Design a protein around this motif. Structure first.
Motif, PDB file in Angstrom:
ATOM      1  N   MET A  12      18.044  -9.779  35.617  1.00 25.66           N
ATOM      2  CA  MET A  12      18.923  -8.856  34.479  1.00 25.66           C
ATOM      3  C   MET A  12      19.502  -7.788  35.172  1.00 25.66           C
ATOM      4  O   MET A  12      18.625  -6.613  35.471  1.00 25.66           O
ATOM      5  CB  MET A  12      18.051  -8.791  33.396  1.00 25.66           C
ATOM      6  CG  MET A  12      18.651  -8.477  32.198  1.00 25.66           C
ATOM      7  SD  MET A  12      17.527  -7.791  30.924  1.00 25.66           S
ATOM      8  CE  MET A  12      16.123  -8.540  31.570  1.00 25.66           C
ATOM      9  N   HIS A  13      20.844  -7.685  35.155  1.00 30.44           N
ATOM     10  CA  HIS A  13      21.291  -6.781  36.043  1.00 30.44           C
ATOM     11  C   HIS A  13      21.151  -5.282  35.786  1.00 30.44           C
ATOM     12  O   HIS A  13      21.018  -4.274  36.813  1.00 30.44           O
ATOM     13  CB  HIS A  13      23.101  -6.824  36.160  1.00 30.44           C
ATOM     14  N   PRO A  14      21.143  -5.048  34.536  1.00 34.05           N
ATOM     15  CA  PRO A  14      20.686  -3.449  34.171  1.00 34.05           C
ATOM     16  C   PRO A  14      19.292  -3.495  34.246  1.00 34.05           C
ATOM     17  O   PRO A  14      18.423  -3.718  33.278  1.00 34.05           O
ATOM     18  CB  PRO A  14      21.394  -3.326  32.808  1.00 34.05           C
ATOM     19  CG  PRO A  14      21.645  -4.642  32.275  1.00 34.05           C
ATOM     20  CD  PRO A  14      21.419  -5.629  33.290  1.00 34.05           C
ATOM     21  N   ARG A  15      18.861  -3.286  35.426  1.00 39.25           N
ATOM     22  CA  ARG A  15      17.271  -3.730  35.712  1.00 39.25           C
ATOM     23  C   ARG A  15      16.140  -2.528  34.930  1.00 39.25           C
ATOM     24  O   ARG A  15      15.198  -3.474  34.641  1.00 39.25           O
ATOM     25  CB  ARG A  15      16.975  -3.330  37.270  1.00 39.25           C
ATOM     26  N   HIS A  16      16.429  -1.562  34.619  1.00 48.47           N
ATOM     27  CA  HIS A  16      15.653  -0.723  33.491  1.00 48.47           C
ATOM     28  C   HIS A  16      15.512  -1.373  32.285  1.00 48.47           C
ATOM     29  O   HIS A  16      14.485  -1.166  31.675  1.00 48.47           O
ATOM     30  CB  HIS A  16      16.222   1.110  33.470  1.00 48.47           C
ATOM     31  CG  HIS A  16      17.484   0.887  32.606  1.00 48.47           C
ATOM     32  ND1 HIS A  16      18.712   0.863  33.089  1.00 48.47           N
ATOM     33  CD2 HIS A  16      17.630   0.969  31.270  1.00 48.47           C
ATOM     34  CE1 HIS A  16      19.448   1.057  32.066  1.00 48.47           C
ATOM     35  NE2 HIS A  16      18.780   0.963  30.889  1.00 48.47           N
ATOM     36  N   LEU A  17      16.467  -2.065  31.866  1.00 46.69           N
ATOM     37  CA  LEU A  17      16.256  -3.032  30.626  1.00 46.69           C
ATOM     38  C   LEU A  17      15.617  -4.251  30.997  1.00 46.69           C
ATOM     39  O   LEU A  17      14.996  -4.992  29.788  1.00 46.69           O
ATOM     40  CB  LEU A  17      17.681  -3.417  30.091  1.00 46.69           C
ATOM     41  CG  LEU A  17      18.305  -2.281  29.187  1.00 46.69           C
ATOM     42  CD1 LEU A  17      19.919  -2.835  28.894  1.00 46.69           C
ATOM     43  CD2 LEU A  17      17.513  -1.561  28.183  1.00 46.69           C
ATOM     44  N   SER A  18      15.173  -4.585  32.132  1.00 47.92           N
ATOM     45  CA  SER A  18      14.354  -5.782  32.393  1.00 47.92           C
ATOM     46  C   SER A  18      12.829  -5.460  31.960  1.00 47.92           C
ATOM     47  O   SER A  18      12.540  -4.374  31.825  1.00 47.92           O
ATOM     48  CB  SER A  18      14.611  -6.423  33.819  1.00 47.92           C
ATOM     49  OG  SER A  18      13.635  -5.427  34.895  1.00 47.92           O
ATOM     50  N   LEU A  19      11.990  -6.686  31.930  1.00 51.22           N
ATOM     51  CA  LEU A  19      10.689  -6.607  31.823  1.00 51.22           C
ATOM     52  C   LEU A  19       9.830  -6.956  33.268  1.00 51.22           C
ATOM     53  O   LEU A  19       9.997  -7.777  34.017  1.00 51.22           O
ATOM     54  CB  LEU A  19      10.040  -7.467  30.595  1.00 51.22           C
ATOM     55  CG  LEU A  19      10.580  -6.932  29.249  1.00 51.22           C
ATOM     56  CD1 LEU A  19      10.388  -7.956  28.071  1.00 51.22           C
ATOM     57  CD2 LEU A  19      10.015  -5.439  28.985  1.00 51.22           C
ATOM     58  N   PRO A  20       9.021  -6.212  33.620  1.00 51.38           N
ATOM     59  CA  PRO A  20       8.146  -6.819  34.851  1.00 51.38           C
ATOM     60  C   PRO A  20       7.428  -7.871  34.807  1.00 51.38           C
ATOM     61  O   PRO A  20       7.223  -8.372  35.982  1.00 51.38           O
ATOM     62  CB  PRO A  20       7.451  -5.435  35.140  1.00 51.38           C
ATOM     63  CG  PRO A  20       7.081  -4.961  33.520  1.00 51.38           C
ATOM     64  CD  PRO A  20       8.301  -5.163  32.661  1.00 51.38           C
ATOM     65  N   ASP A  21       6.980  -8.398  33.831  1.00 53.13           N
ATOM     66  CA  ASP A  21       6.007  -9.636  33.604  1.00 53.13           C
ATOM     67  C   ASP A  21       6.728 -10.708  33.036  1.00 53.13           C
ATOM     68  O   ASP A  21       5.995 -11.780  32.651  1.00 53.13           O
ATOM     69  CB  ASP A  21       4.822  -9.034  33.074  1.00 53.13           C
ATOM     70  CG  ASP A  21       5.040  -8.483  31.441  1.00 53.13           C
ATOM     71  OD1 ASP A  21       5.965  -8.291  30.994  1.00 53.13           O
ATOM     72  OD2 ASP A  21       3.969  -8.363  30.831  1.00 53.13           O
ATOM     73  N   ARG A  22       8.034 -10.786  32.376  1.00 53.24           N
ATOM     74  CA  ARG A  22       8.562 -11.391  31.328  1.00 53.24           C
ATOM     75  C   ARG A  22       9.891 -11.508  31.570  1.00 53.24           C
ATOM     76  O   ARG A  22      10.524 -10.675  32.128  1.00 53.24           O
ATOM     77  CB  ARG A  22       8.363 -10.850  29.988  1.00 53.24           C
ATOM     78  CG  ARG A  22       7.289 -10.937  29.078  1.00 53.24           C
ATOM     79  CD  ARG A  22       7.540 -10.562  27.805  1.00 53.24           C
ATOM     80  NE  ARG A  22       8.900 -10.924  27.236  1.00 53.24           N
ATOM     81  CZ  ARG A  22       9.204 -11.403  26.056  1.00 53.24           C
ATOM     82  NH1 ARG A  22       8.304 -11.438  25.051  1.00 53.24           N
ATOM     83  NH2 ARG A  22      10.523 -11.837  25.810  1.00 53.24           N
ATOM     84  N   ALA A  23      10.507 -12.575  31.116  1.00 56.44           N
ATOM     85  CA  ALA A  23      11.918 -13.009  30.880  1.00 56.44           C
ATOM     86  C   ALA A  23      12.324 -12.176  29.464  1.00 56.44           C
ATOM     87  O   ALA A  23      11.565 -11.945  28.741  1.00 56.44           O
ATOM     88  CB  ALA A  23      12.314 -14.334  30.854  1.00 56.44           C
ATOM     89  N   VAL A  24      13.683 -11.660  29.652  1.00 53.47           N
ATOM     90  CA  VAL A  24      14.068 -10.885  28.305  1.00 53.47           C
ATOM     91  C   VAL A  24      14.757 -12.043  27.706  1.00 53.47           C
ATOM     92  O   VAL A  24      15.794 -12.772  28.608  1.00 53.47           O
ATOM     93  CB  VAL A  24      14.953  -9.672  28.659  1.00 53.47           C
ATOM     94  CG1 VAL A  24      15.782  -9.347  27.636  1.00 53.47           C
ATOM     95  CG2 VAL A  24      13.773  -8.309  28.907  1.00 53.47           C
ATOM     96  N   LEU A  25      14.690 -12.304  26.467  1.00 50.37           N
ATOM     97  CA  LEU A  25      15.606 -13.378  25.732  1.00 50.37           C
ATOM     98  C   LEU A  25      16.784 -12.421  25.084  1.00 50.37           C
ATOM     99  O   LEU A  25      16.265 -11.321  24.480  1.00 50.37           O
ATOM    100  CB  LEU A  25      14.840 -13.901  24.590  1.00 50.37           C
ATOM    101  CG  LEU A  25      14.066 -15.088  24.852  1.00 50.37           C
ATOM    102  CD1 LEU A  25      13.558 -15.801  23.394  1.00 50.37           C
ATOM    103  CD2 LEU A  25      14.458 -15.966  26.089  1.00 50.37           C
ATOM    104  N   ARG A  26      18.062 -12.764  25.291  1.00 50.05           N
ATOM    105  CA  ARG A  26      19.131 -12.405  24.633  1.00 50.05           C
ATOM    106  C   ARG A  26      19.605 -13.180  24.052  1.00 50.05           C
ATOM    107  O   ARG A  26      20.182 -14.544  24.555  1.00 50.05           O
ATOM    108  CB  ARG A  26      20.099 -11.883  26.040  1.00 50.05           C
ATOM    109  CG  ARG A  26      19.567 -10.609  26.380  1.00 50.05           C
ATOM    110  CD  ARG A  26      19.804 -10.202  27.636  1.00 50.05           C
ATOM    111  NE  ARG A  26      20.993 -10.568  28.379  1.00 50.05           N
ATOM    112  CZ  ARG A  26      21.558 -10.173  29.645  1.00 50.05           C
ATOM    113  NH1 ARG A  26      20.863  -9.292  30.300  1.00 50.05           N
ATOM    114  NH2 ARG A  26      22.603 -10.680  29.990  1.00 50.05           N
ATOM    115  N   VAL A  27      19.816 -12.970  22.696  1.00 48.20           N
ATOM    116  CA  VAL A  27      20.279 -13.801  21.426  1.00 48.20           C
ATOM    117  C   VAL A  27      21.573 -13.431  20.772  1.00 48.20           C
ATOM    118  O   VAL A  27      21.415 -12.372  20.308  1.00 48.20           O
ATOM    119  CB  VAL A  27      18.968 -14.355  20.575  1.00 48.20           C
ATOM    120  CG1 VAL A  27      19.525 -15.333  19.852  1.00 48.20           C
ATOM    121  CG2 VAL A  27      17.904 -14.508  21.334  1.00 48.20           C
TER     122      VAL A  27
END
Lengths: 207, 274, 234, 274, 234, 234, 274, 207
Positions: free
Chosen positions: E57-72
């Motif tokens: 996820m390219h804006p990395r600070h929006l990513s989660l260290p332990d998890r995928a982010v779901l974008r819906v």
RNA sequence: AAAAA
RNA sequence: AAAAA
RNA sequence: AAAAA
């Protein structure tokens, strides 16, 4: 002509403290403009020998200093270390090589040392106006906090909790506790020490 | 366009602290000594916002919400010529919480607005056919703006109390013809049939907790809110949060919610003077 | 124009003398989450302010290497005005957020905190004239409530002209119907002005009479700010 | 939502250069040899934008501003049925300066618009009751769009001259009935009572400098602008910038500003043909 | 109100029994570029869903260290409704994109993929009641079509009340004119509810009757989802 | 339609022959801050262009590793048109900013400057037909005024059809009321077309007549561009 | 404000693969075995979107486009009182392609909309004077929304076929007076004079290729589209892409395009039932 | 067949210079397409023995080259060095370890070496198409500019200011000055050298 | 790096 | 880090 | 990482 205008007074930003050319160490709580000294904060005017200072009564952030023992909350586990919340305007970082005692290995990536939500007791090994505070876990009784509680207070209030010659510290630990420079304290069976230590936050200006 | 993302969500509460919050759940009580089914202290200051037509500052623990209403005369929507309008807006102010930023309402604030709007609407508490002035031609639009000033947990329930309170508190003014609102002359109050309440139950492992605080919301699997009128019809339901609940958890949550609604309604009524 | 602003008895629509302020009420530490907060009421104008920070500013290229960045928001609730205000920020709000920020920039000792931001959110709960200044003062008080170091507190007031008379601390009617409206804020102990505006029209002599009257009000307000902050320790 | 931030602001002028700019301030003169109270060379080309109803390209040193007006027939705002409208828009074009980016007007451009708008409005230079066509029913809206093409310092003063110039330059056309504007027939000019000027004074350490250039604006503690009509009523004041000024600095600034206004007004009048 | 929802013969406007679903049709792998896709039709309500990811996820600070982010994204085409819907996202779409995301969050085994995003785009091609659920199920099916690991499939249905009768799988008329409308989605093999809403009004007993009827429909739908996914290998 | 476009004497509304251009005026280095600038007038159509760069492109993930990114803006001032144009960018402006950028992409030797952006801002001060091309040429000239290396200069013109007659360099009336309007731009020394559009309708033979007439105008314009750039050193 | 930037554009197709795609261009054929002048398989499913007034799902290779129309009764634009309206919107859905993101239409989607709009408009295929109900007072607005579901290359050509198809497919309903649309009664179809086609030719080094696929679009210097009606008037032209073309390339492209249009029109007509 | 079409001509983008297969070094100011050479810029056609070139007359940016002496403006003071404006499309960086002669220390963070607004005279130690230019302060008469002025000109104009065999340089320094490759020059009592050096910018094409 | 599909 | 200039 | 509170 060189004097001081107040005794042990409650003080406020812009407030005139003293006139004359004193030889005082720089403080964030006082502002020298030419031959006048002013309070920058809501605080307590106090005088010591021929010097003086403002003891801030207000403020929830901690300003880092090198060699402060500080208890942090791990926030992120980065590839080569950990980003720590030490309740300062700057996040702190503990490099893996420090806590381990050697460089990272290929087959690593565990958080079994430290994860998010863990507390760490640590010392600030490096800090100044240019860089974020760097932590070391080397000293005795540092590293991951396994047991205990952690009570949060204003860093500004820490010298009151210790008490002149660790005397408040004494009257706590005689009834119930490590006091960090951070406005955090580590700690029998559900004895409510905190109900007290909050009362000292909200009565520091008395007795 | 736009899209809903998993929050990268700051509130990293310590492992240690999770253990502590639920420790006394076995004894039926919480971190603040309260019963698993109890609400936090509730206060309601009416007419707080003096240029509002009606207003209510709600304090529920450390959660603080100011709702206020403004009434305007308006064209009825042509598909509902025999009704007035209700428009509900919620703002999660950047004052409320360190990680709220200023912008147009986000997904949480919009969802808040809409759950409150449905509850008020589906309760029939506010009969919009009572808001007509000249049918077909002109009606009242009730603008209900709800401002979350302090995020102390369970903002939805406090938004719902502030809304009802503010609506009950809404002055209505004479309408002069020639149509104009004379604001020197209050002729009535906003006509409500009854109050409504929303009751939020959080799932925390094996436990269901009413009116979760900030820490409790940080650890909860999910929450589910139930709205009631004084006859204890269910008048709205929304599960929110990233976790699932069993059918039994939902069954139990409603039973618990409804038992709490009874008490909460009586207390709201006290604050309203009805 | 329409209403008489100065009545035959020499008094104003609300009964005040021209050198008389509206009443003032101040609350500190009103919000639990904010690092500092305040409510300021001047007559029926009421703002709430909340401060967070200093804290590292996450879009780092927007940060300053030697200074904290002040981030300020002046906002009016929709029910703060006689007619409902749309919550979308208006050009006025945009201008006033800048003017207020720049006023705070002279007071906050931002150079303590390189690379940080200090957020200041101000909402107007009731607008009855002078909200930019009530807002700014609430901000000063909240910064102090947050223990953020500052040169001085900021006190301010709008002076103006009504039916040819220089008046202190305008109300709505005077703001809407008067000939001049001149908000002034200062760091009173440093004799420094931080906000200064005029809309309307004044001769240079009038401008100076009015400025002179502002300073008197400002010092009265300053003393109330000081005592408000001291109150919970007294 | 939205919020005002301290600029992270590029123009890192050399230490060396600061010393140099003020060096000759002692002799009452500047980097460009000019007196501390002098304006830069001023030119005003009217009717520059040929499809504008009135227009003015202003060059003040290296600052360049094109204002143009368009007139439309409009409903008067119902609260002011016996007046026409004036709408002022300022754009700081990304053409003007390397660090301007394209977007809707930012806070500086909005503030510019509004200070100019107040000055024109509070001067009574433009009497909007003169812009009525049929009272209650129809009036002129004067759209004044002001485009900053080159940022050479003190853009506000140049925006104010371009605005007045463009307004003086505004053709008015016959209105035919049946209402329509016949643009083959110019019946008048926009009726102004007099010109207005804004005079910006910058504080540079111990010095007050009129009409600051780009370098001077880079070093100034703050600026304060004063608007005047030909009778030397003050008709608007705005201090901008992150620094404070003493009461004495403001007192002195106005005295200086007003003395400059006299000369500047006479020169504007020359350019206008009045 | 206006129309009769339950006719004298005890049947509904479309001829269905109260415990009877609308018909269902499902297509998988309908898009060539998407990592997974599906079309779900429930009566005349039709959605298409497309999945991409997991991918960093390219804006990395929006990513989660332990998890995928779901974008819906829940979106309605302008020609999906009786009257043209403006393509600008509406508040409803914003709420429903959240409610759907949070339903998917309980199913997708996001902890497999630290620092990634999994995008889920859903467009409603025809809206005839229950589109949030058709949308959510299309999403479940597309995730599976993409081989993204999940706890379970998600099946859902709106139960409700019409002229005092508890009914299963509402249509438009029942949605617009009924007394209650209660979308429920589950992971049926785990007995876990992932989406749960009610608008309208119900007694607690009715609520429980309706919830009980939902579970029956849901299990019928679940079996059709399972067989749809199995179909191309059978 | 309404007006006669080709008069009985075979001439156009403005008196021109069908193969006759409007007059042209060019100024270079008109702005002090811009790295390069120009004003181009073709008849009453007038644009100004400003170039900045090359300079490192700060959102680096939007940069190109082997190339400069061209950033281009076609904008119309509100007083450039007969009726006031809203300054908010319109779909036309959005399309024309792309079409112009892509025309410039073939000329600018962008591979000199990895990881940079070259900004090109164009404002139309007067629009009387052909503004996209006047805008593009102003851009070419400003790039050159900025000393940004380029394959060639870009010259262009709209040819079209009016009352069945192929005409060169349309004016407003011809643009609004004609049967066809065909903007063409080239790098004339490289015989390469960089912008090519048609709106209206033409037989293929007409299209080819018109294209042939464009090239003649383009070369006349090219020679004026060359001499304009050379002028300050002559 | 806003500005057009060179795309930082993902599709980094392998060097190896470029060689392969054009290998058989010498034999007049492509990667998929097709002739340089051939279109991909075309299918057109009408009435795909059932609540649309007319609709068309177009599949051109792996490109998939759903156009649908909605008709509303409207005020004619006062400058064209004897015409109805056509409004064309194209969305490149984030479903279509991995690197499309959700937002308002970008520059490619807006350009798509506008090229299609011109083609339909300048073809005179749809005579808007046929869409009047009461002249001056009321007309039809045809909202044409075109949704790109799968980006398989040459989306413009598929948008143009889906549009025409959807317009041909558009039901028209009785208009009752008192004005209202009775949707139980279809009185007609949308009146079109003929179909239109857009034919996109890509330049690939020495070669011109009709209907480029995704890989071909990744390697092309540029593309140029030509629109035709059945009498083979050119009715729109747009070159897009960052590369130039010679005059001869354009000459040759049109000759090729037009020869393809003949076949494509006949096939579209087959799908339409005309 | 191999010729040249112009003498010392003012030249313009797209303009044909020469035909034939010359063996010329690559330049940004010329474009070879097969057997034809074109000007990419507004410039001056010049010929040297059997080769030729375009001397750009236009352009305000400097294109970095390794071993160029360049005077920069410090823009940012980073944790381990300084970001410098050398009037190029790329910012330059001077690493602290270079200017110091050793690695950074724990107790550092001063800008007493270099701050924002300081000029530095420096040499480009590293640069190419892939990376931003890296600076070294090692050489004699490099580092912080304490005294002097700094006059800014087009880098394109630098060879004119030096003058063939430092001859323009001579006729400046005889009346009044270091000329960097950067379009910047470092420099008795308020003698206006600059009024002259600007005249050479705006008359370079003559005499 | 507003409201009901 | 909508449509035609 | 438009205008006047």
């Amino acid at each position: 002509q060189e004097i001081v205008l107040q005794p042990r007074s409650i003080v406020v930003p812009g407030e005139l403290l003293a006139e004359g050319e004193f030889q005082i160490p720089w403080s964030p709580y006082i502002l020298k403009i030419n031959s006048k000294y002013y309070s920058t904060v809501v605080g307590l005017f106090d005088v010591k020998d021929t010097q003086f200072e403002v003891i801030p009564l207000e403020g929830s952030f901690y300003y880092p200093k090198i060699n402060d023992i500080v208890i942090g909350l791990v926030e992120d586990v980065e590839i080569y270390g950990w980003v720590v919340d030490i309740k300062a305007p700057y996040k702190a970082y503990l490099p893996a090589s420090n806590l381990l005692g050697r460089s990272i290995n290929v087959g690593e990536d565990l958080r079994r040392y430290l994860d998010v939500g863990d507390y760490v007791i640590a010392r600030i090994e490096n800090f100044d106006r240019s860089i974020d505070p760097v932590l070391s876990v080397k000293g005795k009784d540092l590293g991951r906090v396994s047991n205990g509680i952690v009570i949060d207070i204003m860093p500004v209030k820490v010298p009151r909790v210790i008490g002149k010659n660790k005397s408040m510290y004494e009257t706590l630990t005689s009834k119930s506790i490590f006091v960090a420079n951070n406005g955090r304290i580590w700690a029998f069976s559900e004895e409510i020490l905190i109900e007290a230590i909050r009362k000292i936050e909200n009565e520091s200006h008395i007795k | 366009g736009h899209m809903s993302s998993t929050p990268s969500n700051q509130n990293i509460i310590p492992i240690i602290k999770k253990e502590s919050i639920v420790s006394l759940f076995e004894k039926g009580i919480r971190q603040d000594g309260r019963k698993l089914t109890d609400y936090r202290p509730l206060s309601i200051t009416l007419d707080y916002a003096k240029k509002a037509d009606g207003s209510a500052l709600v304090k529920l623990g450390t959660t603080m919400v100011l709702a206020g209403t403004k009434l305007e005369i308006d064209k009825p929507y042509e598909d509902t010529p025999n009704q007035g309008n209700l428009i509900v807006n919620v703002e999660l102010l950047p004052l409320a919480y360190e990680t709220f930023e200023p912008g147009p309402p986000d997904e949480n604030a919009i969802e808040l607005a809409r759950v409150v709007d449905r509850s008020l609407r589906d309760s029939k508490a506010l009969d919009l056919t009572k808001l007509v002035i000249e049918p077909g031609k002109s009606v009242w639009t009730v603008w209900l703006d709800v401002y979350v000033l302090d995020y102390g947990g369970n903002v939805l329930d406090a938004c719902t109390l502030a809304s009802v309170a503010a609506l009950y508190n809404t002055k209505v003014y004479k309408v002069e013809q020639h149509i104009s609102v004379n604001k020197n002359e209050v002729v009535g109050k906003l006509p409500l049939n009854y109050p409504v309440v929303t009751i939020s139950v959080a799932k925390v492992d094996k436990y269901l907790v009413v009116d979760p605080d900030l820490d409790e919301e940080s650890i909860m699997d999910a929450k589910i809110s139930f709205s009631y009128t004084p006859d204890l019809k269910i008048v709205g339901i929304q599960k929110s949060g990233k976790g699932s609940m069993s059918l039994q958890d939902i069954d139990q949550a409603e039973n618990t919610a409804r038992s709490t609604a009874v008490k909460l309604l009586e207390e709201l009524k006290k604050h309203l003077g009805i | 124009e329409r209403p008489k602003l100065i009545l035959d008895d020499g008094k104003r629509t609300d009964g005040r003398k021209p050198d008389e302020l509206r009443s003032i009420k101040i609350e500190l530490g009103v919000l639990k989450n904010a690092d500092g907060s305040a409510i300021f009421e001047m007559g029926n104008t009421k703002a709430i302010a909340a401060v967070y920070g200093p804290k590292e500013m996450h879009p780092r290229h927007l940060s300053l290497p030697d200074r904290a960045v002040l981030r300020v928001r002046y906002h009016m609730t929709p029910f703060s005005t006689d007619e409902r205000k749309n919550p979308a920020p208006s050009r006025r709000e945009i201008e006033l957020s800048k003017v207020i920020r720049e006023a705070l920039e002279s007071a906050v000792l931002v150079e303590l905190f390189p690379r940080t931001a200090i957020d200041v959110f101000t909402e107007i709960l009731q607008a009855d004239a002078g909200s930019r200044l009530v807002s700014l003062m609430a901000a000063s008080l909240a910064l102090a409530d947050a223990g953020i170091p500052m040169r001085d507190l900021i006190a301010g007031v709008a002076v103006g002209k009504a039916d040819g008379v220089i008046i202190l601390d305008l109300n709505e009617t005077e703001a809407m119907w008067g000939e001049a409206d001149m908000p002034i804020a200062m760091m009173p102990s440093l004799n420094q002005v931080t906000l200064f505006q005029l809309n309307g029209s004044m001769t240079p002599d009038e401008f100076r009479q009015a400025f002179d009257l502002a300073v008197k009000g400002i010092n009265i307000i300053y003393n109330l700010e000081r005592e408000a902050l001291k109150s919970k320790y007294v």
